[model samples]
Target: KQLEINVKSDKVPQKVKDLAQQQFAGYAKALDKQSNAKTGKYELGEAFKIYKFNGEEDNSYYYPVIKDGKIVYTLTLSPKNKDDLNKSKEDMNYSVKISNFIAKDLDQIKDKNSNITVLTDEKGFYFEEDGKVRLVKATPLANNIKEKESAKTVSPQLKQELKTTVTPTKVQYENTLKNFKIREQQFDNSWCAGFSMAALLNATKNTDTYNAHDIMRTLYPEVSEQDLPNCATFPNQMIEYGKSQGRDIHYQEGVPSYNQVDQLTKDNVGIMILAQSVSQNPNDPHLGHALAVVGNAKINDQEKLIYWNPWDTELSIQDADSSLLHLSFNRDYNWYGSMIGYLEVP
Candidate 1:
């Protein structure tokens, strides 16, 4: 009776909960079919909804499973439509995992602030307050420390060559090329867009002292300095900023194909990509991030995209796939997200 009451709670959509209940029953039946499974060892705890950016509920319902009075697993059900409930069992897509990363946090937050709405992604947990998204907590899954260590291994000879190669330029042009360099964003803000634009601007204008905060302040005067930490810059805004600086810039609203990236690199054009940061763990959330594509090089005879991640002051490389790009912070922590769009400076 408690399970029924919880499933019908106001946290999630009614249609989604209905589909989840049907899927849970099927999952229970399948678990029972296993030779060594115990019949009554597992039971549902509570159902809740996961939200996306701007407080919109993502189209999935999650339920915690209790074992011996402790939450042991999370059951996730993603039904495309009402008809999914009537489809063959094989067609139903659901997942069960021992890791309850998201549900555990949600449960704790609900204990104190039952009236607040929570949002989450790869970046971390957030909540909407005063018409703005505020950080609740963030988990750093990527090993940026190791990434920085590896970046220091850039040979001294190459550093000197890059220093000498840089020449002063008075105007931005399509063929303008700058020696690759990495820059870090401000520690307290999501200023990747600002940092990325600063890198591009410095490279094209042949200046090296441009800062991310300064660039952002000049681009967005309405946002107070206190609110700048939470501000997010978009592709169109970056393109407009570039245009204002008298650079030839444009944006394309999709991931550029590998061939497209290769051609762009060969032509010495600058690229900045906006992509979703996805994790290998299905339970992990996906978030948005921006990085600058500095150059391309061959690793083991395979071409890769060399990018500067603003999250850290390191130069990272990823395999430039035809569609998907894998950004690795370290061996254990790799994120694969599709490019939402890209800005080109040439």
Candidate 2:
């Protein structure tokens, strides 16, 4: 009745193997966690485990083993420190960029002469200088892994299964984006995230028109929802989910970039919106744009994205850095406008 498997069958039935394939695919999908690249993993039995040990002694190493029917695929990650949360955070922060880079049009990315060197600086790890677009010393977890190039090449049947994972709700997202007004009293407290949540919930088939934050709000009316989430709870949820998936992803202190959104989602078509609270000066919270994270491009450098925001003229995965300075917004806050926190619909 449910997605089932008959491993003993010599001739594989599409329906039976489909469940196994789906499960394997889901496992493959979960490996995209940026935090997982850093923090070891959530303690699990043999179901999964960290590939190479995580610590100061280990720099670049394999991360996990994703299981398929009979074969097991080893997952790798970039380098990071264990004691310093920030360094680990940086590992994840930059990993997403690398992943998105691999996912981009790298037609010019040929051989060693065009090596892409990742520069380690203050803000985080960044890929420096674009002229050299080639492969370097075979790093274990580099985005340009030979195995991964094949992995990203999806089978047509698998691609069809992927479509079954619906979005938060398109019609609801549109209606909420159009009609839902920020409660005047709480508008000053940063309702951008909550207002966005209201829209998501309203879109869900079983749930109300409210998004994630909206559901959280009705549960805790007295608390400052936006301030709490964009700053605290939201990232924590990202962290917790990562932990559950055996990812050691630590929450970092920055606005959620496009790569960050993809990592939080771990690769699902999710409801993401660019939120602004205020400039470094003062302002109120307001959500200006919303999009389904259809795909991603190089993420490490600009801390930006290629989104399919609903109100935009065309389906765009072509824009970059849709933040306060780089994007259009009309909200002001105490300070610190952010692209913070995202929800995974799947």
Candidate 3:
């Protein structure tokens, strides 16, 4: 039994002993949970409180085995080398054959057959439910056969079109949106609408375009570090800014449906649409987030709305890969769940 205090020093309780047994049992159950080998993450069908720590040689993940809010023991996971075990059809068949013959636990087998043979390359053995080999305890190998079957359904043409449609500039000819540098919310996380408007201007009017922070500070002069900036008067501000420089701007508040989307692609328009954020699930129809759309495209008779999210990633700044910022969402998500309102700028 495991203990945080000495039972024989001054006091002992049978209830404490029973509690320790239950806690240890739960600890064993967590360590015994299955983990996906490919991603080196847990695939066990349960929510787990797990965390990771990076190291020079490898990353280690830890999970606390808990019972009644008390942590009994911490289980540590080190990445197992992919080459530690050969993974193939022959290897899987060998594992399955071995599993078919095993009945009792390893120690039980040792008690029955003292001369039972152990493989030289083997670390130890545990039962595999899926009949696939595991590199170490708790790490389950991915099913390669199933993965190949899943990957084969998507066609090359469809993949290429998915990329091309979500791409900017190419969606419209004669006039096209360019210079789409991925703009992320810099300071606070509440300026997505401001960032979206900035993204809209940068995509179409790059010469006079402003970033999210610039738009917030310049247009909404009352904005400060503590307040969230928004696109409440985005079109008016854009027109006012352009008018002072003797430029004519064409824009309007449009429907949140597909009516403006198709014209947006055909007529070289810059557009803005509001959607629900992660706080509101994609399954819900609400407006708490905003994004800009330059165009959209179709594949296999099904259309997808293509747009740019004003969020930055490691690859968002480059000219070529910045096009990766051009993303496509399902029509259902755009129509039923994500769409709230649209502002068309052509």
Candidate 4:
């Protein structure tokens, strides 16, 4: 409608008419669609929107599920507290969970009696399907029964029943995001390929080496953000990983800084691949970053930020955590924006 953009407002006839009443045509048309909008220098308000996506105490959780013989999940995220609810969609903190509430819809439940239940913790909800849900509780499998057969012997399928060499052991990507508290910290900046290589090293422990430009040589190795080309999103790299099982995954060039990083660990890999290679051997052409790409995950939830940094000293896993804390997550300038898609590595 506007310059051929054909935005959503035309569909929001009610908002368009109401906005017409306010004598603010531009503003009212925008209200037609449910999305974020802000007025310049009009800050006096009781509170127009819910700033962050986390529900109840700025927290979110991701759980595991399986689909079509793959390790996938449909997580139902909810607030521990009810303070986040609102009539307007933008002011709500639980949209991500509510939008996908059907993941627990009737079809997903097998036993109706136990599908949804409450626990004494007051912060608990449980649903059941065909898979085993880990309660992490220690309870006797057979209580008050004497001389019972071992339950281990009664597992539905033996390992031998599993698909042979053709079947992959770690064929899918898995991510663990629980109630991990992000210690209010800063992120540091790195200037090399490791920015894109951190998650892979942690997952695969392959430890191959590569250089800037060489990393994306297979694709558009020389994509330009300012001059031309879309950002080479992390999903783009995962597609390459999906092919040939990510053995071709390695660090490539184009770092903001060329500071020397001699090894590959999560923290030292920088905001971009400092270098790259396919060799699983860490010593081949010097190691940098360790994990290998296995696949990509299809996840939709809260806001996520990946942080990378230049080293102040010898980097460790804990140091990687520290670096994420040290750098400001400036989304525009932050390199991880294009790099932290749902990665399926380890």
Candidate 5:
């Protein structure tokens, strides 16, 4: 399967086709189309035709995103198995597919008005080389895409504006805390992304419970417990999956400073912290980790960051310096290595 994106019409921009062929080169399969599709029902207009270019050698599976009778976008599907190392290669191509299809060519598309911007995350997924999961610097191809919005800066002006928005009610805050669930890694450090997602779903959707294994089904339905995914290993996965579910999942690429974090918590938005390493020794020693930020406080002359560690099922707070810039912690909280990026939405 390929990670798919939706386009505007049958007349896919030449830039998209050229980019796909150049960045995602592999064996060709069938080029097919499905008519009378109602896919872009909400996002795209009604009455659309879906076109697809199927491939084998690379195991690519994608269809033209039919929206309102025009082949407006392309949607790439993730590979069949996360643990299947072969899928990594396919994943790279999918990145090109999404980045190009949604944002267009990064190097050439500098005009923010013309391109769809993306939020950036640090480095990339911790990859498997030989056999172990190791952190590898992500290629610029995926990370360098031009985006319309810049990372939010913790500014006083922005802070004043954010105060006008509705903050989460006490019921919502207490419910989120009571509903928090942390499913430790089932296999190495593979389940953080899924675990974090399941927790968000549980909190927002009011689900009874969730674990890494349960979340895996949402990601790879056809796979077994033993073959859980090794990738989809970060915060962005939630944003993408959220949109796929038609939820307005917003993404912020970099770590938010103290004010931003406070703003997120006050808005009662769902917060997932992206870290470079596990505060406690994570089963897997790769890329980074994911957790939720639920609340915060000021204590003992130190500002505290209240959050949840998906690794451990508990609501804990971390001590941050006065500026709220540096996060120092003892045993109560779980800190994943270094902070890389974060995802949040109300």
Candidate 6:
């Protein structure tokens, strides 16, 4: 009955109709073979193909179920053996289950709101709205689906749960920074970038030989060690130095959100944050400084970053909000600062 309902709908594509009929028949047969099998009664709504990045096929089909003309749940179906759908045999077994849509209909929802741009990474689907980005958990817990109804935003508790799961790479970096002996900047003026880079390289590369003066000299070959204090290193220059060491480094401009930093550290990617005191005045003597984000921890149910400040001889832990605005060196200058950008080494 549901197969006919979907097949006859004008909104459903012909390809979707053909595949849904085939898959539903197989699903019904599989249920009949089970000992406690009951009649299949789920109503299939509009069929949607899985989202693929850069034209790559994920070999899955998504079907939302209709309840009183409103979508209630989506069913994801794929080959049991994880073979390509086109190459698989006609009788290939399919695994179908009722669950939240992974990423299929997000575009349709985004289209209704012209200001929203949907984005995805290894972490999952998120959206950029009015210059602010927030992570969205594509799948909702089955028990909480009734309360969600039409509201798709992630709950605060779920968001915290996502942030608090520490990866092994995170633990490794934490240990590396804990064991690393802190060294103050040799130059008193503008060697924060060099020092931060050295700390990141040492922790990531697992070598204790890197030092601030040598890193500064390497980044700015035109300047001698004595002149390094006068020559301020730019973010791009630091990225180039990391590349020279055969590391996979990337740079992102603009202040990163707390979620962004949390996701980066969770993936074990090294972060070198660039903080600026006077964003409007580029020529200010204390315009900006750099620091290494060693790791993150959950302190009393709140997520905080563990950063190694070159100005200090020890690691410091602070919440995301305070860490961005009031870093260790900010107290000495009595000035407010924000992270401008960061260089990440994966």
Q: What TM-score do all the candidates reach, one by one? A: 0.42, 0.24, 0.34, 0.20, 0.37, 0.41
Q: Which stretches of candidate 6 lie over 4 Å from their true place?
A: 1-181, 184-187, 254-263, 279-287, 327-346
Q: Model 5: per-residue lDDT, tens digit, 181-240?
A: 444523243565566666665665556565656656776777765555443454445556
Best by lDDT: 1
Misplaced by over 4 Å in model 5 are 1-189, 229-236, 277-287, 321-346
Instruction: Assess candidate 5 and give its lDDT.
Output: 0.35
Tens-digit per-residue lDDT, 1-346, candidate 3: 1111101121213332233333333223322221111122221111111111110111121223332333323332221222212333122111000000111222232222122111111111222113222221211011111122111122333323222111000101111244544555322344555666666566555544566676566666776654533223344565565455344555433233444556654444456655432223545545444556544333222233444544422111111101111111100112122221223336
Candidate lDDT scores, in order, read: 0.46, 0.27, 0.31, 0.23, 0.35, 0.45
Q: Write the per-residue lDDT of candidate 2 for residues 14-39, one digit (tens) a residue.
A: 33223233232222333233112332
Question: What's the CA error at residue 220 for candidate 1, in Å?
Answer: 2.2
- Runs with alpha carbons beyond 4 Å of true place in candidate 2: 1-191, 198-251, 255-266, 269-279, 282-318, 325-346
**Residue 278 lDDT, candidate 5, scale 0-100:** 24
Which scores higher on lDDT, 1 or 3?
Answer: 1
How much RMSD separates candidate 6 from the native structure? 21.7
Which should have the higher lDDT, number 2 or number 3? 3
Give me the overall lDDT of model 3. Answer: 0.31
TM-score of the candidate numbered 3? 0.34
Error of 1 at 226 (Å): 1.4
Cα lDDT for residue 21, candidate 3: 33
What does each candidate score in C-alpha RMSD?
20.8, 21.3, 24.8, 22.4, 23.5, 21.7
| Count of clashing pairs, candidate 6 | 0
Cα RMSD (Å) between model 1 and the true structure?
A: 20.8
Better of 4 and 5 by TM-score: 5
Ranked by lDDT from best down, the candidates are 1, 6, 5, 3, 2, 4
| Alpha carbon RMSD to native, model 2 | 21.3
Question: For residues 50-150, could you state the per-residue lDDT of candidate 4 as single tens digits?
Answer: 00111111122222122333221222222222233222323333311111111233223322333221111111122212333222111110111122322
> Could you arrange the candidates by TM-score from highest to lowest?
1, 6, 5, 3, 2, 4
